[PDB]
């Protein structure tokens, strides 16, 4: 109910369930609340570019950007009002708290509240209303770095997409390698241009020694040069087109080039892992094919003999696959019993020995049974051996054989519902026949030591009706 709906990454539809609480409360896994955080994540992509772009390129702060920086901020203001009507899921008790008084105290005692209220205040707009219309000082403008707190939402979204199985894993872990590098390039370029702008001598800079007056020109002309330099310095191509001349920027260039080893040495460590781990199953199966095909050529065996060997191996991988699809091992008994009763109760009752049996023992006879799976044409019970157990057929055919050093078909085919090896276990005699499979089937094993005491433990024993049913079946 609760853990079933938190698995998907985009919520679930809600219709008249018990955690409705007050009619003015919205749940935190609803679908309408999961199409509202995506909008904020999309708008986060615009509010990280603008702050850095306005840190350096002064006199661009007046224009349409002044209006957009308020139109965007209005929504992040509304979200703070909204966050008081949202339930949260407790950790000690997996019940989800849905009380207004309990959720109002959870938020006011967290640093997230103060950071959210700090990262939404208009600094430049308010300052010019009271003080002069233009703010300056070579320092006033570092408050534009407050709006870099809103990257936690993207970091959070990129954790709800990996856990889901409806989505790829080569496509989602490679789109997370574009944003990081593009942001890195943006930051480096803007910082370098800012360093160059505020210098005493304008003809002793990296741009002032090529273009005489980089100031009093267009903004985008200064933007293209400082993106070009950053993208050339990354990726380790170097022309002599543009380089550093001062001593304030040689140090920044050194520190920028020293940190770039660990990122280009990290992209490879992921693009190698993806390719290595995507190419194993084909390797194994092709190894099997190459191993088999080498035997059938050098010895010049006919075509049918090779064909049968190649057709027989395919079923073995299928048996392994179905053997690797079992997950109910260590769940509590109250669920294993229900699953077993739903899957296997019908066929146990229709057994020739298990007829007229007390209903008390059948309940715990249905439990602690583990299903099996076998490829066709394989031995399960041999001849002249100590009995150990017996099997019950479920969904396949089987054959019965009895010979010393050869094979002689006896009796006939056995469909679902039949037993196997029941004759020897009751008389404590070595098994008098041999049984081999015919097709891909599943069987249920019981055992002998358990069954020795299981029958004796009960108080409802009939007048050896076990013997009566056994003799009725054996007579034919």
């Amino acid at each position: 109910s609760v853990s079933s709906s938190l698995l998907p990454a985009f919520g679930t539809f809600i219709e008249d369930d018990n955690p409705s609480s007050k009619p003015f409360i919205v749940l935190h896994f609803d679908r309408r609340y999961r199409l509202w955080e995506l909008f904020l994540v999309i708008l986060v992509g615009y509010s990280a570019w603008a702050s850095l772009f306005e840190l350096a390129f002064e006199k661009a702060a007046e224009g349409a950007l002044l209006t957009i920086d308020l139109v965007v901020d209005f929504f992040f203001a509304v979200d703070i009002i909204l966050t008081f009507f949202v339930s949260y899921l407790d950790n000690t008790t997996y019940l989800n708290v849905t009380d207004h008084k309990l959720i109002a105290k959870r938020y006011l005692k967290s640093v997230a509240f103060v950071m959210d209220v700090a990262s939404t205040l208009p600094i430049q707009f308010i300052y010019k209303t009271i003080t002069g219309d233009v703010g300056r000082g070579q320092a006033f403008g570092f408050l534009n770095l407050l709006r870099l707190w809103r990257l936690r939402r993207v970091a959070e979204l990129f954790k709800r997409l990996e856990k889901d199985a409806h989505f790829n894993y080569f496509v989602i872990r490679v789109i997370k390698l574009l944003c990081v590098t593009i942001f890195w390039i943006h930051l480096a370029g803007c910082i370098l241009y800012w360093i160059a702008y505020h210098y005493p001598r304008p003809t002793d800079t990296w741009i002032g020694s090529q273009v005489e007056d980089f100031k009093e020109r267009s903004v985008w002309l200064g933007y293209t040069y400082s993106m070009y330099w950053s993208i050339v310095t990354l990726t380790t191509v170097g022309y002599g087109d543009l380089h550093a001349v001062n001593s304030r920027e040689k140090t920044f260039n050194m520190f920028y080039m020293l940190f770039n080893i660990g990122l280009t040495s990290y992209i490879i460590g992921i693009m190698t892992n993806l390719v290595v781990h995507g190419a194993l199953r084909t390797f194994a199966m092709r190894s099997a094919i190459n191993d088999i095909l080498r035997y059938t050529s050098k010895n010049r065996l006919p075509d049918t003999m090779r064909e049968q060997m190649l057709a027989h191996m395919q079923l073995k991988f299928k048996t392994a696959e179905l053997r690797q699809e079992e997950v109910l091992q260590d769940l509590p008994k109250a669920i294993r019993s229900s699953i077993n009763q739903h899957l296997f109760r019908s066929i146990i009752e229709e057994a020739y020995l298990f007829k007229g049996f007390p209903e008390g023992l059948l309940v715990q006879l249905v439990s602690q049974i583990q299903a099996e799976y076998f490829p066709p044409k394989m031995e399960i019970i041999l001849q002249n051996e100590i009995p150990t157990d017996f099997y019950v057929i479920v969904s396949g055919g089987v054959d019965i054989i009895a010979s010393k050093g050869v094979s002689e078909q006896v009796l006939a085919k056995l469909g679902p519902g039949s037993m196997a090896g029941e004759i020897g276990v009751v008389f404590n005699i070595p098994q008098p026949f041999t049984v081999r499979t015919r097709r891909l089937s599943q069987v249920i094993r019981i055992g002998h030591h358990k069954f020795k005491e299981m029958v004796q433990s009960d108080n409802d024993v009939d007048a050896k009706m076990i013997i009566a049913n056994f003799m009725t079946y054996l007579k034919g």
Partner: protein
């Protein structure tokens, strides 16, 4: 011990200072100067005091004793290990200046012998568990890279300066007057060139001019070809061995979903399976999925672990009045702990009683699902047993139990109980008497107690 650790960790701070000062003094200076000719004597004093205090030492070994105190025995080992080289790097340079004027340079590069103590610290600390393994490789690699860069820069500037004819050098062809500038302006260009060459971003200024620098650069450009390829293998190793859990989660969910779809289970029967499956990954450390990590041990260990967990709790129970030590011990060391998600049934109506439960933590409410009504008549806390009368009387369970919290319980089947009772019946007589002594109440179960006494 404790007093020795503090003093031992002190000298590892001065080794960095020595390793930084010695190449700079070798390359960028010619004669001693006051600001840097003061701390050197202090460092020599500290190291000499370390030298004299090395005979009152004890060492440990697998074969040798933990503490060996025979002083004359230690001397034969110590004097034959590093006694000759530990003394040469302590004489003040001013004392040795009178030997030769040109020898001031080659005498300042012998202090790098004290750098062995960092090599005996990055391997001693390797074999430890309280510190992560992620932060014992990166520090070493970073230190190696920084040392290489610094040494190469200093040697290149020395080669440039020692030559006559200041023009036609890698630095004089770019700066008109490079010998009339501050010592901290010549030190930035050299490191600029070194980091420009090590990362293979060749800009185009500050390149060699004559043959000696060509040979030096030829020898310096081959070391990096291996030093760079020895840094990608480690990163790939680290990345591949750090992203296992999430693929396990995805694979398990895929397998469970595929199996459930294959057998066409009813829509309501997958929710319990999924909730239980995810609850282990939530409590990955509390013992549900950790059981096989604990079930690979012999009988004695896992029999003694339950002592610290359930022995005291099992004493104060409804039943088990006064059995001294044996039946309680055997019953305690045979249970099986299980966790249950909130709001899940554990006992239904008339469903073939097989076992009983003991509740350790959490809360639950006894529920009587009658014809059309669901009562909350009883509520149980930690300590009480659930499902007892239905297993000692072979009668279907009276009520149902639904939890309201993440609860941890205990289990034991009837067959083991009966076998234990048959093994020792003398202590068994107390249990049935306890039930009769405790069914003395004025509420409704008296009507069924009459039936019990009819069948008891």
């Amino acid at each position: 011990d404790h007093k020795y650790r503090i003093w031992e960790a002190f000298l590892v701070v001065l080794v960095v200072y020595t390793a930084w000062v010695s190449p700079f003094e070798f390359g960028f200076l010619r004669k001693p100067r006051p600001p840097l000719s003061i701390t050197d004597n202090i460092v020599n004093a500290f190291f000499a005091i370390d030298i004299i205090m090395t005979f009152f030492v004890g060492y440990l070994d697998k074969s040798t004793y933990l503490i060996v105190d025979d002083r004359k025995q230690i001397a034969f080992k110590y004097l034959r290990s590093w006694f000759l080289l530990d003394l040469v790097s302590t004489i003040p340079s001013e004392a040795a200046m009178r030997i030769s004027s040109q020898s001031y340079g080659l005498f300042n590069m012998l202090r790098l012998w004290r750098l062995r103590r960092v090599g005996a610290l990055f391997a001693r600390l390797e074999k430890d568990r309280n510190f992560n393994y992620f932060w014992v490789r990166c520090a070493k690699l970073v230190c190696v890279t920084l040392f290489a860069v610094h040494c190469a820069a200093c040697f290149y500037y020395l080669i440039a300066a020692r030559n006559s004819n200041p023009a036609k050098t890698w630095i004089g062809a770019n700066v008109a007057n490079f010998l009339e500038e501050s010592l901290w302006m010549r030190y930035v260009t050299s490191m600029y060139w070194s980091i420009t060459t090590l990362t293979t971003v060749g800009y185009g200024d500050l390149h060699p001019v004559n043959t000696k620098e060509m040979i030096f650069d030829i020898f310096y450009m081959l070391f990096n070809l291996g030093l760079t390829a020895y840094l990608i293998g480690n990163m790939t190793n680290l990345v591949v061995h750090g992203t296992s859990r999430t693929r396990n989660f995805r694979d398990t969910i895929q397998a469970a979903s595929n199996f459930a779809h294959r057998n066409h289970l009813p829509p309501r029967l997958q929710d319990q399976m999924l909730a239980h499956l995810c609850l282990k990954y939530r409590t990955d450390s509390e013992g549900l999925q950790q059981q096989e990590t604990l079930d690979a041990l012999p009988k004695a260990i896992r029999s003694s672990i339950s002592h610290f967990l359930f022995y005291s709790l099992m004493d104060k129970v409804y039943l088990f009045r006064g059995v001294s030590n044996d039946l309680l011990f055997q019953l305690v060391s045979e249970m099986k702990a299980e966790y249950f998600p909130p709001k899940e049934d554990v006992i239904l109506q008339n469903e073939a009683p097989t076992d009983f439960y003991i509740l350790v933590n959490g809360t639950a409410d006894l529920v009587d699902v009658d014809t059309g009504t669901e009562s909350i008549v009883r509520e149980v806390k930690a300590g009480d047993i659930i499902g007892e009368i239905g297993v000692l009387c072979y009668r279907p369970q009276l009520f149902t139990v639904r939890t309201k919290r993440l609860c941890q319980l205990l289990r034991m089947n009837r067959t083991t109980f009966l076998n234990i009772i048959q093994a020792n019946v003398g202590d068994g007589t107390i249990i049935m008497n306890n039930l009769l002594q405790h069914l003395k109440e004025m509420n409704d179960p008296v009507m069924t107690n009459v039936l019990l006494e009819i069948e008891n």
